Design a binder for this molecule. Structure first.
Ligand SMILES: O[C@@H]1[C@@H](O)[C@H](O[C@@H]2CO[C@@H](O)[C@H](O)[C@H]2O)OC[C@H]1O
Ligand SMILES: O[C@@H]1[C@@H](O)[C@H](O)OC[C@H]1O
Ligand code: NA
Length: 330
């Protein structure tokens, strides 16, 4: 690694380079992080269930540790995430009797959570994924069903962004989602964000999760999505990048190691992806990987539990993979 290029330095004039972490991986992958990234995202510890597990009970310890690490190394921090249909405790939507609360009560709870969380990290966290995955991933409907939407109504996103803006008007607020480059969904995300911005809602950027495969989405689809979203005038962040060795239809669990073909195609894939990101450096301001080395990735258990994936630029021994060389040479 002595003579190895540093990711954040290579892309210094293009965009920040980030990694998703947790207290455990910060220790396990500390040197890689210190040598390559200038942005950090909490993989799980800033989600609702990990910040306010019970009403009035805030558990900022783990998030504080992540922020402390980032700040001690002059790394930016992306806040993830405030309002999402997943990883949110049941108490949030229920009353004493266990029945669903009213619109006003849920809005009060949403405002309280957002205000408390955002104000704590004001000045240390420069952006927040305010709304995560609200758009439907299947069907002809625009929005995915969720307790937030059911109880409050379809304007729940407008409210979330306004509450977050009030809490920290200097933060960049994002709508974050996956499968963001498939045409049908791209148009739903575009329509949603355009509608919000047309109402003056403080949504400053779109977060493209980029949980991609070797084949999907195509480079043309990625280019089209970047251009489509950029045309709204918002900032773009690639937020949870990883390149899975398995396509959606591939649920094999017996592969103990990736084939030389997988490794080679992944290298080509990462080179093509970063070449495209660099081309759009004027609108993309940050590229965060959902991890940093293959010794830790949520793809080991998703969508198939108990297997192994090799989605990042560094291997399990923290050594650069062929993908690393193609990525930094664009
Ligand atoms: O440890 C896992 C996390 O890595 C995972 O993170 C999510 C990945 O999918 C994205 O769409 C989400 O935004 C991101 O939070 O969440 C589940 C957890 O078990
Ligand atoms: O659970 C979600 C999964 O269904 C999607 O494919 O990727 C993002 C995850 O959060
Ligand atoms: Na840029």
């Amino acid at each position: 690694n002595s003579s190895l290029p540093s990711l954040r330095d290579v892309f210094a004039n293009d965009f920040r380079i980030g990694a998703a972490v947790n207290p455990v991986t910060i220790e396990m992958q500390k040197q890689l992080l210190i040598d390559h990234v200038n942005s950090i995202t909490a993989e799980n510890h800033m989600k609702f269930e990990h910040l306010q597990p019970e009403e009035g009970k805030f558990t900022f310890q783990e998030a504080d540790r992540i922020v402390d690490f980032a700040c001690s190394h002059r790394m930016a921090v992306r806040g993830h995430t405030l309002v999402w249909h997943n990883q949110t405790p049941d108490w949030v939507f229920q009353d004493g009797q266990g029945h669903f609360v009213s619109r006003d009560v849920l809005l009060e709870r949403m405002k309280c959570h957002i205000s408390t969380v955002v104000r704590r990290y004001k000045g240390k966290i420069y952006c927040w994924d305010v709304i995560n995955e609200a758009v439907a991933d299947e069907g002809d409907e625009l929005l995915r069903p969720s307790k937030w939407r059911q109880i409050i109504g379809d304007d729940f996103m407008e409210q979330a962004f306004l509450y977050a803006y009030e809490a920290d008007p200097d933060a960049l607020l994002f709508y974050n989602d996956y499968n963001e480059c498939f045409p049908e969904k791209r148009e739903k995300i575009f329509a949603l964000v355009k509608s919000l911005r047309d109402k003056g809602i403080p949504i400053h950027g779109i977060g493209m999760q980029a949980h991609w495969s070797l084949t999907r989405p195509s480079l043309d689809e990625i280019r089209a999505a970047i251009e489509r979203y950029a045309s709204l005038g918002v900032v773009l962040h690639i937020t949870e990048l990883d390149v899975s060795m398995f396509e959606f239809h591939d649920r094999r669990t017996d592969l103990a190691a990736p084939t030389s073909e997988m490794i080679e195609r992944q290298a080509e894939r990462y080179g093509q992806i970063f070449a495209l990101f660099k081309e759009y450096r004027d609108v993309i301001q940050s590229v965060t990987f959902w991890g940093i080395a293959d010794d830790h990735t949520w793809l080991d258990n998703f969508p198939v539990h108990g297997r192994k994936n090799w989605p990042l630029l560094f291997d399990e021994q923290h050594k650069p993979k062929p993908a690393f060389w193609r990525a930094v040479s664009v």
